């Protein structure tokens, strides 16, 4: 799941940035309302499906679809913020969703179930996992200070400068993405334990904590100082935007 | 001195949150109250120098999001409106820290409560002191978070969990 | 028998409805002295209908009683804080028994 | 309660009463004060006060950026 969501998903958006957008500038302009519509629908609709999922891994998987369609709005905005934000969200998603799949796997390796109904109350037995899970829950909500907020806001900036309607529909994911991330976290971690389903518990061991460390450092490092990444990108981003025009 | 105003409550919350197992209920209560109260005293000094002395303070730490004309920055603005809100926030928070010291004495989880109190204070300071809209947005969201964490501070109660989600 | 159980079951419905209507009277009155007058009045109705022996007209009075209680019920009833629905319910509850904590999980060996 | 005594947490769990909590509290005091020293030095270096105060103020003791941004048509 880590490889599928963190790397393989990036190949379609990478292919849009490397081939379609620069090689066919005229067609890209013609299909911009078409891409805007498909992405906006996917953001609204799949966010609402995520709300009604009952499997831990299904909620995280469905969240990935909405994040990736916001990426496409950014890259097809065709400006520095949109394309710059789209690349940063792509990178952020590969860290946040990967960390989230690692949290669910931590739960699954021990108890062998993905159904949210069985869990709950976990803060009283696994406080270390609960704290790490909350942090990546916030990063999945694009909380300011996390890596995902930088890419998210930059894409909305770039979309607003082109079409204020698509930027408005895309900004609805701030409300929807908050709803399913906190509902997921609370039903798993908060509340009371249910000893009839689960009664034996182990918090993270040394290998699992170490696994989470570079994800926390990377998420914080991009969230507070994205300049180390944006500086190395802006020259390539600028020439991608200018490709096909001479004024 | 102006950076110590904003970042002292963060330091107080950091010690209680990460090292509350070494301080206990009494140690974490003193730690978070002292840092917030010191920041309260510096805020009184800042009100005297900026509002009474008519001398505004501008402080820029580093850029946050620099993308073409987009220029969100880690920057702080201290004018007459700012030091009024600094006084309100730091003074009331210091009292509430003192009040909670005995109000939550019988609670099993006081150190986490004091840590959440100080992190709220730090985000509210980041809201009133920012010099751009994005830093204000960071404070705006941070106080939304800290409020959520404190409304369901009794995580076992279902109405608190319903209320905290509704607030957010 | 059956008439005993059927009438005894009808007995329980009346006694509970009196219990609920008597507590909801204190919700609307607040003050003790106003509650004395209002409790006496509520009792007198249960006494006006206590003579009815038509088991069927009783089932009809009981159903009319529940409808009256459900209609004129206080929208904000009082709850003891530790009781279900109270302000202190499920706050710092005692840990459940039967919880075990495993050490040295997931070792390479 | 019973099982929470076997559960490790950063904030200490319920009714945390470390025996040496006073020396740990005082050690924690020193760390914050040692952390505050570079912060204060950087703050003093970074502050910008374009206006002279009406009366002398405590930040004139350590801050040397008073009345500096007068030439504004030169800022870049």
């Amino acid at each position: 799941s880590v490889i599928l969501a963190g790397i393989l998903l990036k190949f379609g958006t990478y292919g849009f940035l490397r081939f379609s957008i620069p090689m066919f500038p005229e067609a890209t302009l013609c299909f911009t309302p078409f891409i805007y519509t498909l992405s906006a629908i996917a953001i609204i609709y799949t966010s609402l499906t995520t709300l009604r999922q009952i499997d831990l891994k299904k909620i995280i998987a469905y969240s990935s679809v909405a994040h990736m369609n916001l990426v496409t709005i950014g890259m097809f905005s065709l400006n520095i913020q949109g394309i710059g934000g789209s690349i940063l969200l792509m990178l952020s998603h590969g860290l946040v969703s990967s960390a989230l799949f690692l949290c669910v796997g931590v739960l699954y390796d021990r108890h062998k179930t993905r159904l949210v109904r069985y869990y709950g109350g976990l803060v009283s037995t696994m406080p270390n996992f609960s704290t790490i899970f909350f942090f990546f829950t916030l990063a999945n909500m694009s909380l300011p200070g996390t890596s995902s907020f930088i890419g998210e806001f930059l894409i909305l900036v770039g979309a607003f400068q082109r079409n204020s309607l698509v930027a408005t529909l895309a900004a609805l994911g701030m409300i929807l993405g908050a709803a399913y991330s906190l509902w997921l976290y609370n039903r798993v971690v908060s509340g009371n334990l249910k000893p009839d389903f689960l009664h034996k518990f182990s918090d993270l061991n040394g290998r699992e904590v170490f696994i989470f460390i570079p994800f926390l450092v990377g998420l914080v490092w991009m969230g507070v100082y994205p300049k180390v990444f944006l500086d190395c990108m802006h020259t390539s981003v600028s020439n991608l935007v200018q490709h096909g025009k001479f004024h | 001195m102006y950076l110590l105003i904003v970042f002292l409550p963060l330091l107080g919350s950091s010690v209680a949150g990460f090292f509350g197992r070494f301080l206990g209920s009494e140690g974490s209560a003193i730690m978070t109250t002292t840092c917030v109260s010191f920041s309260s005293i510096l805020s009184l000094i800042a009100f005297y120098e900026v509002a009474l002395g008519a001398s505004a303070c501008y402080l820029r730490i580093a850029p946050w999001i620099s993308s073409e004309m987009f220029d969100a920055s880690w920057g702080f603005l201290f004018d007459s409106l700012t030091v009024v809100m600094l006084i309100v926030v730091t003074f009331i928070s210091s009292l509430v820290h003192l009040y909670s010291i005995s109000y939550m004495s019988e609670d099993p989880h006081s150190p986490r409560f004091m840590c959440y109190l100080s992190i709220f204070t730090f985000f509210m300071l980041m809201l009133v002191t920012g010099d751009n809209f994005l830093q204000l947005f960071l404070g705006w969201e941070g106080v939304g978070l800290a409020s959520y964490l404190l409304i369901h501070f009794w995580f076992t109660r279902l109405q608190a969990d319903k209320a905290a989600i509704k607030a957010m | 028998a059956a008439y005993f159980a059927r009438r005894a079951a009808q007995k329980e419905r009346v006694r509970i409805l009196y219990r609920r209507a008597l507590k909801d009277t204190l919700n609307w009155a607040v003050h003790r002295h106003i509650f004395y007058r209002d409790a006496s009045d509520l009792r007198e109705k249960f006494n006006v209908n206590q003579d009815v022996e038509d088991v069927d007209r009783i089932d009809k009075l009981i159903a009319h009683g529940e409808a009256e209680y459900n209609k004129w019920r206080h929208p904000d009833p009082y709850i003891v804080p530790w009781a279900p629905g109270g302000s202190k319910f499920c706050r710092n509850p005692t840990p459940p028994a039967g919880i075990e904590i495993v050490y040295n999980y997931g070792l390479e060996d | 309660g019973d099982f929470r005594a076997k559960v490790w947490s950063m904030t200490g769990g319920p009714n945390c009463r470390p025996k040496h909590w006073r020396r740990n509290t005082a050690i924690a005091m020193f760390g914050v004060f040692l952390v505050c020293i570079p912060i204060a030095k950087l703050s003093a270096k970074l502050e910008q006060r374009p206006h002279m105060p009406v009366r002398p103020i405590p930040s004139q003791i350590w801050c040397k950026n008073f009345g500096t941004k007068d030439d504004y048509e030169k800022e870049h």
């Binding site: 993270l204 | - | 495993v102 | 490790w8 947490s9 945390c16 025996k19």
Partner: peptide, 28 residues
Amino acid sequence: SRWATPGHEERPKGYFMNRTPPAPGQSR
């Protein structure tokens, strides 16, 4: 009394990363 009588936790509750400590004098 909460400020003048030291605490009772001779050692903290639980173990960091849930690993039992090694034998006295031994290293992990």
